[PDB]
Amino acid sequence: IVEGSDAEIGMSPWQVMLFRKSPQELLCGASLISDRWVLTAAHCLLYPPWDKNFTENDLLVRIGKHSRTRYERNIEKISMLEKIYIHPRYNWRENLDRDIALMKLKKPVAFSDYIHPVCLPDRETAASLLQAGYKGRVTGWGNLKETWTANVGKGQPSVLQVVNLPIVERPVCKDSTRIRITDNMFCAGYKPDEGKRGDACEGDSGGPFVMKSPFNNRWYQMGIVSWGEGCDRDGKYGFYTHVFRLKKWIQKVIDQF
Amino acid sequence: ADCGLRPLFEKKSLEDKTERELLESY
Amino acid sequence: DFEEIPEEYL
Numbered sequence A: 001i002v003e004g005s006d007a008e009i010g011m012s013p014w015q016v017m018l019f020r021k022s023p024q025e026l027l028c029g030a031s032l033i034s035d036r037w038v039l040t041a042a043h044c045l046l047y048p049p050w051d052k053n054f055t056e057n058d059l060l061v062r063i064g065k066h067s068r069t070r071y072e073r074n075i076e077k078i079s080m081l082e083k084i085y086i087h088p089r090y091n092w093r094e095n096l097d098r099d100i101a102l103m104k105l106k107k108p109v110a111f112s113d114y115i116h117p118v119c120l121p122d123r124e125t126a127a128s129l130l131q132a133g134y135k136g137r138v139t140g141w142g143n144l145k146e147t148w149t150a151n152v153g154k155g156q157p158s159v160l161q162v163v164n165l166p167i168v169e170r171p172v173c174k175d176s177t178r179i180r181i182t183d184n185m186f187c188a189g190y191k192p193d194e195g196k197r198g199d200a201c202e203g204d205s206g207g208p209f210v211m212k213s214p215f216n217n218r219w220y221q222m223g224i225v226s227w228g229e230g231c232d233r234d235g236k237y238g239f240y241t242h243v244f245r246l247k248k249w250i251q252k253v254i255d256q257f
Numbered sequence B: 001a002d003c004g005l006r007p008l009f010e011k012k013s014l015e016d017k018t019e020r021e022l023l024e025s026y
Numbered sequence C: 001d002f003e004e005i006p007e008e009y010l
């Protein structure tokens, strides 16, 4: 997360860490949707161009975390994956279209003050909230600045970062890049005229973009950090997987398995 | 049934440090 | 820089 701030304890009890067994590595962010399911970006598990094709046994899920590096004894919970599901139409080839996947835990996690699921949106929530200018929140242990040789300093945070960003109109998103945009994606970030900074970044993928509903006091997962061109660049916006639009696939998996 | 309500926030009637900016924008 | 976790999981 670039230009964010340290999260507060318990602020995002749904934040999950995709951790690789060997070598130890922070793979990506994720989200807790129930006591046995986690939602994440497909490219976190499958992305041929960089050689990723992970299986249920190469990973671990760590929930209730704050510190990126610390083994938080008696706070964090470590779970094993039973099975992973990738949307059958995910497109790694060209634009990360349909960048989403589900992971079924081997056993359910017990909820605590640090572990609690986020809500998946319904039509109503999706319509009232996913509007240009409304702000959402993004969290993760990803890079603090775009990788660049001229950078001096630490690019990794010690604790979970958070940043709030406004939703941007579809036609502004489309004009800012040359990647083909689809409706299974939405963009967020400040416009040049707002002269503000903030963004998700490498290592933030799979993390949730949530919104809080004035109608019921609850937090809804509206997007998944998917891709960008740089981090915090002028005139660019971050892209997120449109969760509501892929919700039918989500329910079918959970219902079947 | 209980999704989205944070134990240390919502369940206690507590607000996080930037929570309100989200609502201001709505 | 990751602190070691229980081997079980590992």
Ligand SMILES: *[C@@H]1O[C@H](CO)[C@@H](O)[C@H](O)[C@H]1NC(C)=O
Residues within 6 Å of the ligand: A048, A053
């Ligand atoms: C990834 O590995 C799994 C292992 O079963 C294999 O079935 C699948 O074809 C692989 N896919 C790619 C695109 O490498």
